[PDB]
C-alpha cells in the first residue's frame, strides 16, 4: 500500500482510483491546509507518510535537516517529461534535483465576488494589494467578509512586497512595518484560514480573500455549478505577488518507498497530470500536458502567467532560522 500527505483540493477525484486500478497499489490520502502543518508533522518525525508535498522554500529547510531520502531516479523514467527550465529554477532549494519532484505550481492573490465588491466599493478597480491591506478599503469590505490565510509565510511576505520592501528581507525593522499594516486591518478580517474560503467564496459567505491561483479558480467554477449568479475572479495585484512551486518528496523514515516511486512516475505522465491540473486549476511541470488540457486552464494568463507578469513576482527564499522565528513571533502577535 501507499500513504500520501498532500494539500486540500489538490488532486482530481479519480486520480487515485485510476492509480490503484492500474497498479493495484492501494492508497491512503491525508491532507493539510498550510505548509506549517506539514512541516510540523515532519519534525514529529514518526509521521508515517511515504509522499509529502511542501512548497519550494519549506522543502529547502527540510532538506538541510535530512527528512527525505535521495531520489532513486532509476525508478523515475518519466523524469525527463519534466520542464528542464523549471527544475533548474528549483536548485535554490534542492541542488541538483536530488530529493523532490515537482507537482503543481502557481501564484497567490485576491479572489473576490465581483458583484458584492462593486456593491460596496463601486467601480474602484481591484488591482492593488491595498484592497486587503488598507483600512479605508477594508472597513467596508468587512460587512461582506474578508478572509486572510493563517500563515505568516503568506500574509507577511505579501505585506512586505505591497509596501515595496523586500518580501525576503531579514530585517526586523521591515517586519515592523508589515506587522503594523496587517494589525491595522485585522479588525476587519472575518477569519484567518488557508482553505475554508474556497467553499466560503462560492456560497457567498465572504466576498474577498487572500487565496491561491487555483483555489479561487476552483471556488469560481464551484460557484457557477451551483448556478446562483456568483462571479468569483482572481487578480494578481499590480505590485506582484508570491510565485511558488510545490514538490513531492519521499521521507526517509518511509517504507513503501518503491510504491511511492510508482505513483510519482504515474504523475509524470503528460496524460494524467493534465487531468489533475484540469480539475484543480494549477499549472503543472509537464510541458507535454498543456496541449492535452482544457484550454480555459491551459491558456489562462493567471494560471500560466507570461514573463512580464513573472518579472515582478517574488519567490519565497530559504530564510535563516533566526528570521523564521521573527515571522512566527510577529504572526502570532497578530494571532
Amino acid at each position, epitope marked *: 500500500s501507499l500513504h500520501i500527505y498532500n494539500w486540500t483540493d489538490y488532486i482530481a477525484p479519480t486520480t487515485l482510483k485510476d492509480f490503484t486500478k492500474e497498479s493495484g497499489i492501494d492508497v491512503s490520502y491525508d491532507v493539510f491546509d498550510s505548509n506549517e502543518t506539514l512541516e510540523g508533522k515532519l519534525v514529529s518525525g514518526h509521521s508515517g507518510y511515504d509522499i509529502v508535498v511542501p512548497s519550494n522554500n519549506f522543502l529547502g529547510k527540510q532538506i538541510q535537516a535530512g527528512a527525505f531520502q535521495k531520489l532513486d531516479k532509476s525508478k523515475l523514467p518519466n523524469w525527463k517529461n519534466l520542464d528542464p527550465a523549471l527544475l533548474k529554477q528549483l536548485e535554490v532549494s534542492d541542488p541538483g534535483n536530488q530529493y523532490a519532484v515537482p507537482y503543481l505550481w502557481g501564484t497567490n492573490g485576491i479572489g473576490y465576488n465581483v458583484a458584492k465588491v462593486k456593491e460596496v466599493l463601486g467601480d474602484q478597480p481591484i488591482d492593488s494589494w491595498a484592497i486587503l491591506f488598507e483600512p479605508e478599503n477594508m472597513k467596508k469590505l468587512a460587512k461582506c467578509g474578508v478572509a486572510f490565510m493563517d500563515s505568516g509565510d503568506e500574509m507577511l511576505p505579501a505585506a512586505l512586497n505591497y509596501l515595496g520592501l523586500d518580501p525576503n528581507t531579514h530585517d526586523p525593522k521591515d517586519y515592523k512595518k508589515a506587522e503594523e499594516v496587517l494589525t491595522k486591518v485585522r479588525p476587519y478580517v472575518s477569519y484567518f484560514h488557508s482553505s475554508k474560503y474556497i467553499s466560503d467564496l462560492a456560497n457567498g459567505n465572504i466576498c474577498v480573500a487572500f487565496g491561491y491561483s487555483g483555489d479561487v479558480f476552483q471556488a469560481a467554477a464551484r460557484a457557477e455549478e451551483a448556478g446562483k449568479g456568483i462571479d468569483i*475572479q482572481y487578480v494578481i495585484p499590480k505590485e506582484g505577488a508570491n510565485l511558488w512551486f510545490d514538490l513531492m518528496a519521499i521521507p526517509a523514515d518511509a517504507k513503501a518507498a518503491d510504491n511511492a516511486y510508482a505513483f510519482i512516475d504515474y504523475l509524470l505522465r*503528460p*496524460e494524467v497530470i493534465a487531468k489533475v491540473s484540469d480539475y484543480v486549476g494549477y499549472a503543472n511541470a509537464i510541458p*507535454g500536458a*498543456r*496541449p*492535452l488540457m*482544457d*484550454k*480555459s486552464v*491551459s*491558456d*489562462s*494568463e*493567471e494560471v*500560466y502567467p*507570461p514573463q512580464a507578469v513573472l518579472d515582478k513576482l517574488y519567490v519565497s527564499a530559504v530564510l535563516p532560522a533566526k528570521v523564521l522565528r521573527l515571522q512566527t513571533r510577529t504572526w502570532t502577535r497578530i494571532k
Partner: single-chain antibody, 225 residues
C-alpha cells in the same frame, strides 16, 4: 515532415451529412490536440470543435453540438468531423489544424459545397509600401482579457498560417516587422516595414473561457499599394 492531409472534396444535398477525414504525418499524433476551422467563401474563420486525440475529449462550439461529431482512429493517426444537417450555408472550406492551444500547422482544407435550397475587428486597412499599420481586435474579460491570443495570416488562396502565438511570440519564419501588443481586452498586431507580400487577411483567435470556443476575429483584409 509535420503535415496534415485532408480528404477528397464533396458536393452534398441540404438534408445530408458529410465526413471529412484528416491524416497527420511526422509527429507523435496523440501528443497534440486537433482543431477544425471552417471558412465559408469570402468570409472569415470559424471555430468548430477541438478533439483530444489521446482521450477522445470533445469540445464542440455551442453552434455545432447536436449536429457535429468528432472522432479519431488513433491506430491510423487521423481525425474525423461529421456535420449532419448540411444547409445552404455550410458551403465552405473545412480546415484541419494541429492544436497546441494555438494552431501551428494547418491542413490544406477540404471544400464542402452544399447546393440546393464575437470579436470586434475592423474589416480592412490599406497601406503604402514601407509604412507601418496596425490591426486591432477587441474582446472581453472572457477572452482577449484572460487567455493567450494567436494571430493568423491568410495569404491569397492559401490556408491560414500561424503568425503569432502566446500573445506576441513569433514562429520561426515570421519576421521582425510582425509583432503584437496587448492592453486590457485588446490585442493589436502591427506590421512595420510593410512590404507588398504582406497583402492578406489577418485573424486573431482567443479562447473565450465562458462560451467555450476559440473565438476568431471577423477578420481584416490588408491591401498594400
Amino acid at each position: 515532415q509535420v503535415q496534415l492531409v485532408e480528404t477528397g472534396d464533396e458536393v452534398k444535398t441540404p438534408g445530408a451529412s458529410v465526413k471529412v477525414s484528416c491524416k497527420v504525418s511526422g509527429y507523435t499524433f496523440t501528443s497534440y490536440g486537433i482543431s477544425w476551422v471552417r471558412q465559408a467563401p469570402g468570409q472569415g474563420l470559424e471555430w468548430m470543435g477541438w478533439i483530444n486525440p489521446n482521450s477522445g475529449g470533445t469540445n464542440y462550439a455551442q453552434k455545432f453540438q447536436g449536429r457535429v461529431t468528432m472522432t479519431r482512429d488513433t491506430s491510423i493517426s487521423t481525425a474525423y468531423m461529421e456535420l449532419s444537417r448540411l444547409r445552404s450555408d455550410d458551403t465552405a472550406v473545412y480546415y484541419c489544424a494541429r492544436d497546441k492551444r494555438y494552431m501551428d500547422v494547418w491542413g490544406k482544407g477540404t471544400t464542402v459545397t452544399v447546393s440546393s435550397g464575437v470579436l470586434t475587428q475592423p474589416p480592412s486597412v490599406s497601406g503604402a509600401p514601407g509604412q507601418k499599420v496596425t490591426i486591432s481586435c477587441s474582446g472581453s474579460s472572457s477572452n482577449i482579457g484572460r487567455n493567450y491570443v494567436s494571430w493568423y495570416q491568410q495569404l491569397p488562396g492559401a490556408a491560414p498560417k500561424l503568425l503569432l502565438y502566446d500573445n506576441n511570440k513569433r514562429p520561426s519564419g515570421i519576421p521582425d516587422r510582425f509583432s503584437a501588443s496587448k492592453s486590457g481586452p485588446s490585442t493589436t498586431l502591427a506590421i512595420t516595414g510593410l512590404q507588398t507580400g504582406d497583402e492578406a487577411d489577418y485573424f486573431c483567435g482567443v479562447w473565450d473561457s465562458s462560451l467555450r470556443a476559440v473565438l476568431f476575429g471577423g477578420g481584416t483584409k490588408l491591401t498594400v499599394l
